[PDB]
Amino acid sequence: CGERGNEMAEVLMEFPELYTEMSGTKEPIMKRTTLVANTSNMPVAAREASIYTGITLAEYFRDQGKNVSMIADSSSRWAEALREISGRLGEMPADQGFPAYLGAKLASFYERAGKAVALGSPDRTGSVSIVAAVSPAGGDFSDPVTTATLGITQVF
Amino acid sequence: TPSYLPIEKIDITAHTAHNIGDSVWMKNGTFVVASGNQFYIKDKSLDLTDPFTYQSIGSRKILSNDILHLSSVLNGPLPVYHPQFLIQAIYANKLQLVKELLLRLFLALRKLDFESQDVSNLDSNLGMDPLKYFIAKDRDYPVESFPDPYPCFNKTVSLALTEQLTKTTLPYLTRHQQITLITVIEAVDEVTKNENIVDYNGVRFLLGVKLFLSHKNIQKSILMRDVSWALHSDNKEILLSSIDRHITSWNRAREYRIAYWIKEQDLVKKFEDIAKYEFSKDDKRDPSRCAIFYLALKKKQILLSLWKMAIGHPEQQKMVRFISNDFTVPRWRTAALKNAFVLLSKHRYMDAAVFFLLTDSLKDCVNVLCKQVHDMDLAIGVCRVYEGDNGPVLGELLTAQMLPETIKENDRWKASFIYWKLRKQEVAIKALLTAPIDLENNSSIVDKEVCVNRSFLVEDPALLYLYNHLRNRNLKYFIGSLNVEAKIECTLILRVTDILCRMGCNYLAVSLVKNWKFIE
């Protein structure tokens, strides 16, 4: 979500060359790894549709009995996109220009992760882990996005 | 049990390493074995230290310790007091005879005790005249009387026998067989009380349940044999009232399979009572459990009140707000169907059935009960209480869910029951004799090679006794075809004997062949 296009190109180049014996034989890690490339030069409003698509894909694959891992690099670029939409949208900004509903949005996103029994039969159980990289402005962990995520996430 | 059981391990190797040269039986079981120029003749006696002899003899008591005599105890005609002979003489219409044999057993045991003789001297036939076993009909039996101190089998003789059978060990009978003999004494005591009310398919059912109670460890519900004995009885009310004391919970209305045979007019009352109980279970009040019984009766109002008074339950607020609607409205019908299919995906099968019954979509309530909940017993109950006694949804349910498995398992009790609930009586009676795969183009259901066959197809003598009953009451369906019916009656009589003979009840096989009435 709002990252380099040479970091999504390296994943498309190395994951096929990297293999996993979790299936019993070396199979490209790319065979089980999908991508949601939305670089920074790409529209800011699609940094929000990049995080929804990823968690929905993980939830879909958890609904097949799989233990998926959504790696969201970065969650602070989706929050900046909501800060850029809100600012152009007129409503009152919060502490650092972010909308007052940033925390609710982050909480709703992270509440989609978890271990669950899948709807329907055969009875299967899956899980969705979320690993969200936050990019605090200047490295300061007192940022609104970082504080909200630390409030929500269980591992820091 | 295995059809064959080893009784000795003649271990000649314990003396020499040379292999057995030749083996030959001889007069009286003498088993001559040769090796080199050196014989190892073993007499027909037994060494009780052998594991095989010790296991085969078991707890029995035998007059002689022989391979010949042992092979005449594990096999051959039963002593007329053996429980497996008395229950088979009760299933055959010979209850009076069983009472007389029990009386004679008591008299012989008293004779032995009075003379201080050993019980092993007890006569196997109890001094019975064999012609008695051949009497065609129960009411034609010449029930003679004995001297005054114990003239005829009754409560006093029953108690005396139950005491004696604990104070003595009957010969040839494993202790478990003696326990079942005591339960047979109790069952005959019960039948004598009810003998004046229930027809004789009631007596067979009563003995079936009394034997079931003694085998709850290995038997989880009365066999379909007993369900079919009761289903064709004219006094289902008496049978139900006799087993009522045990039907407290649904799990016990499912052991006696009451949904199959009890009259609809009693099944309604039994659902009401079972709903009462299932609600006030040990744990706490929960209208979730008793919902199906109250909807099947068409008592949604009682269920609504039950939800209301269940203030503590977390689901109470949703269910009271939902159930109160009128489900004739198309919108609410669709809402209830949607909720039913959501509960089927949240793995709440019983609640899905409940909701599918709110809207009167019985065909979907019964399919969720028999396929996802695994209660054909409850599915039949709901079908019979909701719509009516026989069909139409019950017919489709049985033909779809039970008929295939019945054909594959080659079960004729279930097949007869199914073609009875489909009110196809003419072929329901025939399904007792001919295997299900050969009925009503059932070969179209499963290929004949998928069905069970080989030694697994062990006959069931009772299966014939029921036919001879139905055949005689439903003659209207058999007057039209006699030669074809005889062609299979004369096969199943000779295949029902040859198990009555292989299970030691030879005296009953001769009675079956002697008394069978061909419908000319």
UniProtKB/Swiss-Prot annotation, chain A:
* Residues annotated with Phosphoserine modification: S121
By what name is this protein known?
A: V-type proton ATPase catalytic subunit A, 2nd part
The lineage, from the top, is: Eukaryota, Fungi, Dikarya, Ascomycota, Saccharomycotina
Part of the intact protein present: 738 to 893 of 1071
From Swiss-Prot, chain B:
Q: What does this protein do?
A: Component of the RAVE complex, which is required for stable assembly of the vacuolar ATPase complex V-ATPase under many conditions. Required for transport between the early endosome and the late endosome/prevacuolar compartment (PVC), suggesting that assembly of vacuolar ATPase at the early endosome is required for transport from the early endosome to the PVC.
Show the disulfide pairing.
Answer: none
State where the protein is found: Endomembrane system
Quote additional remarks.
Answer: Present with 149 molecules/cell in log phase SD medium.
Q: Where are the WD repeats?
A: 219-260
Instruction: Give the protein's recorded name.
Output: Regulator of V-ATPase in vacuolar membrane protein 1
User: Self-association or partners: how does it assemble?
Assistant: Component of the RAVE complex composed of RAV1, RAV2 and CBF3D/SKP1. Within the complex, it interacts directly with RAV2 and CBF3D. Interacts with the V-ATPase V1 subunits VMA1, VMA2 and VMA8.
Taxonomic lineage is: Eukaryota, Fungi, Dikarya, Ascomycota, Saccharomycotina
